[PDB]
Protein backbone atom coordinates (compact mmCIF):
# COMPACT_ATOMS: atom_id res chain seq x y z
CA UNK A 1 0.00 0.00 0.00
CA UNK A 2 1.28 3.58 -0.87
CA UNK A 3 2.79 5.78 2.04
CA UNK A 4 1.90 9.59 2.39
CA UNK A 5 3.61 12.38 4.48
CA UNK A 6 1.51 14.76 6.77
CA UNK A 7 2.50 18.54 7.08
CA UNK A 8 3.64 19.54 10.66
CA UNK A 9 0.18 20.70 12.05
CA UNK A 10 -1.74 17.52 10.81
CA UNK A 11 1.16 15.33 12.23
CA UNK A 12 0.73 16.87 15.77
CA UNK A 13 -3.12 16.13 15.59
CA UNK A 14 -2.47 12.33 14.79
CA UNK A 15 0.29 12.01 17.56
CA UNK A 16 -2.26 13.37 20.21
CA UNK A 17 -4.17 9.98 19.89
CA UNK A 18 -1.14 7.53 19.98
CA UNK A 19 0.52 7.69 16.46
CA UNK A 20 4.39 6.89 16.49
CA UNK A 21 5.59 7.48 12.80
CA UNK A 22 6.45 10.30 10.18
CA UNK A 23 4.58 8.49 7.16
CA UNK A 24 1.22 6.52 6.99
CA UNK A 25 -1.14 4.48 4.60
CA UNK A 26 -4.43 6.39 3.86
CA UNK A 27 -6.31 3.65 5.91
CA UNK A 28 -3.98 4.60 8.94
CA UNK A 29 -4.61 8.46 8.42
CA UNK A 30 -8.46 7.78 8.48
CA UNK A 31 -8.07 5.47 11.68
CA UNK A 32 -6.32 8.19 13.87
CA UNK A 33 -8.57 11.14 12.51
CA UNK A 34 -11.73 9.09 13.43
CA UNK A 35 -10.43 8.33 16.98
CA UNK A 36 -9.64 12.17 17.40
CA UNK A 37 -13.25 13.21 16.39
CA UNK A 38 -14.84 10.68 18.77
CA UNK A 39 -12.61 11.36 21.91
CA UNK A 40 -13.19 15.20 21.58
CA UNK A 41 -17.04 14.59 20.93
CA UNK A 42 -17.13 16.92 17.84
CA UNK A 43 -19.93 14.81 16.19
CA UNK A 44 -23.60 15.83 16.77
CA UNK A 45 -25.21 13.46 19.31
CA UNK A 46 -28.60 13.48 17.49
CA UNK A 47 -27.59 13.57 13.74
CA UNK A 48 -24.23 11.66 13.84
CA UNK A 49 -23.07 12.28 10.12
CA UNK A 50 -22.58 16.08 11.06
CA UNK A 51 -19.18 17.23 12.54
CA UNK A 52 -19.04 20.77 14.28
CA UNK A 53 -15.31 22.07 14.28
CA UNK A 54 -15.43 25.98 14.57
CA UNK A 55 -13.63 25.98 18.02
CA UNK A 56 -11.04 23.18 17.20
CA UNK A 57 -7.64 23.07 15.34
CA UNK A 58 -9.43 20.66 12.79
CA UNK A 59 -11.56 23.66 11.56
CA UNK A 60 -8.41 25.85 11.02
CA UNK A 61 -6.73 22.99 8.95
CA UNK A 62 -9.84 22.14 6.77
CA UNK A 63 -11.06 25.86 6.37
CA UNK A 64 -14.76 25.13 7.45
CA UNK A 65 -17.04 25.57 10.57
CA UNK A 66 -18.75 22.08 9.87
CA UNK A 67 -18.90 19.16 7.22
CA UNK A 68 -20.96 15.88 6.49
CA UNK A 69 -19.30 12.34 6.59
CA UNK A 70 -21.50 11.45 3.48
CA UNK A 71 -19.36 13.86 1.25
CA UNK A 72 -16.49 11.38 0.49
CA UNK A 73 -14.72 13.35 -2.37
CA UNK A 74 -14.74 16.68 -0.31
CA UNK A 75 -13.11 14.98 2.79
CA UNK A 76 -10.26 13.31 0.65
CA UNK A 77 -9.61 16.81 -0.98
CA UNK A 78 -9.35 18.57 2.53
CA UNK A 79 -6.80 15.83 3.64
CA UNK A 80 -4.68 16.24 0.36
CA UNK A 81 -4.26 20.09 0.99
CA UNK A 82 -2.53 19.00 4.35
CA UNK A 83 0.05 16.49 2.76
CA UNK A 84 3.68 17.23 1.61
CA UNK A 85 3.83 17.61 -2.27
Amino acid sequence: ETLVRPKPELLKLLKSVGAQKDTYTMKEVLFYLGQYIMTKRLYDEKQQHIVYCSNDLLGDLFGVPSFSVKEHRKIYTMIYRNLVV
Binding site: T25, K27, L30, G34, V69, K70, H72, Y76
Partner: peptide
Protein backbone atom coordinates in the same frame (compact mmCIF):
# COMPACT_ATOMS: atom_id res chain seq x y z
CA UNK B 1 -22.56 3.88 17.10
CA UNK B 2 -24.02 5.84 14.11
CA UNK B 3 -20.86 8.12 13.69
CA UNK B 4 -18.60 4.95 13.55
CA UNK B 5 -20.87 3.32 10.84
CA UNK B 6 -20.77 6.51 8.55
CA UNK B 7 -16.90 6.77 9.05
CA UNK B 8 -16.48 3.04 8.01
CA UNK B 9 -17.96 3.93 4.60
CA UNK B 10 -14.97 6.38 3.91
CA UNK B 11 -12.61 3.48 4.68
CA UNK B 12 -14.19 1.52 1.76
CA UNK B 13 -13.06 4.28 -0.68
CA UNK B 14 -9.30 3.60 0.27
Amino acid sequence: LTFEQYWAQLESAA
